[PDB]
Design a protein around this ligand. Structure first.
Ligand SMILES: [Cl-]
Ligand code: NI
Ligand code: NI
Ligand code: NI
Length: 337
């Protein structure tokens, strides 16, 4: 049976109300936008609020496994920060203290384990990250807890260079699940991995891109540990901002948009005027705004989720519960069947 992991965005109230409705779809909940580690090696839960407290209580009531998702997101600046991993990984005391805090959290909180979400590990810290994750996985396992790691997806053992701080083989060996963050392929200002002719606007999570990234993942990590990733958000290029799955058809209806679809990415988009394209590294600006929403629908979610079966993956993962509706989960299940 596929392992289906939903990350709740604790900063949106709908994460809790959605869980109440959609919990049966899930194998586990990753508690998102809540927990982080600091440059000083402190575990924080400064994102904690009543929404997430309610999610925790509800999941426990349903015997649904919970994983705090502990990130290198710096709340002072609202961004993922390489300074956090650079500090913790290279200091013996900070590394050890981080591990103990994480085990304490999992034990005292009655959680199934920890989802490590360090997104800004640099290539200079590759060996140090392997050492840390090995220690963390061992410590959690010794306390009868599990470890999931979230991974910014790379193309190969060598590409891109900036992601070579992540040793897929070693990290895969240390964890229970290897969650591949197959989203944010293209957005206002960027286009990743050499796909989509390095143009934006484009897909949040293209099929061709996912297939390449997941094919690489299973070549280094046992496929049964690998989780695909799906976004429940898209990009409105007229305003340069993310929009939620629940709002896609509202945006389309407001603009009387014309629905279209891209073959290579198997991703729908809706336009309400002529669209010009830019390239990776050319920033979105109001002057460069385009009348197009790149989104997903039942057909695209079904097609993308078929990769779980095709590649023999252990399951899939969703960022985030709180942005979606019943139709998203119906489409996901239709692709797992
Ligand atoms: Cl290694
Ligand atoms: Ni609009
Ligand atoms: Ni066309
Ligand atoms: Ni919303």
């Amino acid at each position: 049976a596929p392992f289906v992991l939903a990350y709740t965005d604790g900063q949106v109230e709908a994460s809790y109300s959605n869980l109440q409705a959609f919990h049966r779809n899930l194998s586990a909940v990753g508690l998102g936008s809540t927990y982080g580690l600091t440059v000083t090696g402190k575990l924080r839960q400064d994102g904690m609020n009543e929404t997430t407290q309610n999610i925790i209580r509800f999941a426990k009531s349903q015997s649904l496994p919970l994983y705090p998702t502990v990130s290198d997101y710096n709340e002072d600046i609202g961004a993922f920060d390489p300074a956090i991993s650079h500090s913790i990984l290279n200091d013996r005391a900070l590394s050890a203290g981080t591990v103990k805090q994480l085990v304490k959290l999992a034990k005292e909180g009655g959680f199934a384990g920890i989802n490590l979400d360090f997104e800004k590990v640099e290539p200079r810290n590759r060996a140090a990250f392997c050492a840390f994750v090995k220690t963390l996985g061992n410590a959690l396992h010794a306390s009868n807890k599990k470890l999931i790691i979230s991974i910014p997806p790379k193309l190969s053992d060598t590409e891109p260079e900036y992601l070579q701080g992540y040793d897929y083989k070693a990290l895969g060996a240390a964890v229970d699940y290897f969650q591949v963050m197959t989203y944010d392929q293209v957005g206002p200002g960027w286009s990743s991995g050499g796909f989509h002719n390095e143009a934006w606007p484009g897909p949040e999570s293209g099929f061709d891109w996912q297939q390449a990234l997941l094919s690489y993942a299973v070549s280094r990590v046992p496929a049964s540990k690998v989780l695909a990733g799906l976004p429940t958000y898209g990009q409105d290029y007229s305003i340069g901002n993310r929009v939620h799955w629940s709002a896609y058809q509202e945006i389309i209806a407001e603009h009387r948009a014309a629905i279209h679809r891209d073959a290579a990415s198997a991703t729908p988009y809706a336009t309400w005027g002529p669209v010009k394209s830019f390239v990776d590294g050319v920033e979105w600006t109001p002057e460069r705004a385009q009348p197009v929403l790149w989104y997903d629908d039942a057909a695209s979610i079904k097609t993308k989720t078929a990769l779980v079966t095709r590649l023999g993956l252990g399951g899939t993962s969703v960022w985030a519960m709180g942005y979606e509706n019943a139709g998203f989960w119906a489409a996901l299940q239709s692709g797992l069947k």
